């Protein structure tokens, strides 16, 4: 039951990523007006033929992805070591980890009140409901919810959170990425300044095995992240799609 200090680096590296997701998430959630308007048609009765014909709330979640895809190049760009990567490995992490940085980022406007997204007044207050009026489907959605919980149960402190997202983002197991020595030497540089931070900072009881926890959460979003991908390729069939998008989400999931 070693409970070393925190590093000078380690202590940097924490700093640092605190200051980083300070100035890529905003709590306020004030941009999300300038986003395409949230609709949502009538839709009790959860009918694919009417989501998919819609789609009405696709080009305000589709912005709200696209702009927090954005803000995660600009978190990823500031992780102590990405830099060091090549610009090629770099673009692969990001393509493949986006949605689940975005799921887990999105932890923090998520609340166990009612089970929602709450981003301000009613209008960006985000339910199951309003997902499957993105041409989304409960196979998603379901697990997607419970992952949410799963996380906000944690109780992660902003640095197990903000440690988190850069170890989501600098995995060494991405397809296509060259030099996945050098990403798992950042990776476990990230690593081990969390367990160790855990050790050192984490009270009990939210402590206990809370590393483990953390990191089967990591495997949760592969699984995510694989069905999101499938139902965004059916999304995807539907004509007129396109233009529901952006070009980055189009990029990022096509
Ligand atoms: C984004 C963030 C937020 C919510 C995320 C949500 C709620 C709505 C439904 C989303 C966007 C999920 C669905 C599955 O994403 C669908 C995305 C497309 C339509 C491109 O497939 C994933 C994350 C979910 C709000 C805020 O916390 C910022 C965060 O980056």
Request: aromatic share 6%.
């Amino acid at each position: 039951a070693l409970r070393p200090k925190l590093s000078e680096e380690q202590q940097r590296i924490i700093a640092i990523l605190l200051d980083a997701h300070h100035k890529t998430y905003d709590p306020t959630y004030s941009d999300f007006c300038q986003f395409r308007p949230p609709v949502r048609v009538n839709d009790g009765g959860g009918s694919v033929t009417l989501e998919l014909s819609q789609l009405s709330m696709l080009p305000h979640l589709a912005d709200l992805v696209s702009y927090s895809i954005q803000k995660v190049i600009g978190f990823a760009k500031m992780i102590p070591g990405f830099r060091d990567l090549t610009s090629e490995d770099q673009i692969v992490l990001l393509k493949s980890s986006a949605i689940e940085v975005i799921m887990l980022r999105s932890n923090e406007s998520f609340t166990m009140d009612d089970m929602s997204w709450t981003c301000g007044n009613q209008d960006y207050k985000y339910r199951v409901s309003d997902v499957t009026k993105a041409g989304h489907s409960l196979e998603l959605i379901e697990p997607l919810i419970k992952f949410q919980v799963g996380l906000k149960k944690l109780n992660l402190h902003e640095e197990e959170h903000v440690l988190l997202m850069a170890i989501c983002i600098v995995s060494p197991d991405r397809p296509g990425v060259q030099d996945a020595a050098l990403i798992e030497a950042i990776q476990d540089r990230l690593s081990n300044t969390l367990q160790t931070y855990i050790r050192c900072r984490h009270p009990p009881p939210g402590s206990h095995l809370l590393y483990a926890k953390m990191i089967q959460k990591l495997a949760d979003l592969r699984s995510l992240n694989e069905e999101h991908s499938k139902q965004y390729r059916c999304l995807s069939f539907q004509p007129e799609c396109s233009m529901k998008l952006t070009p980055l989400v189009l990029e990022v999931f096509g």
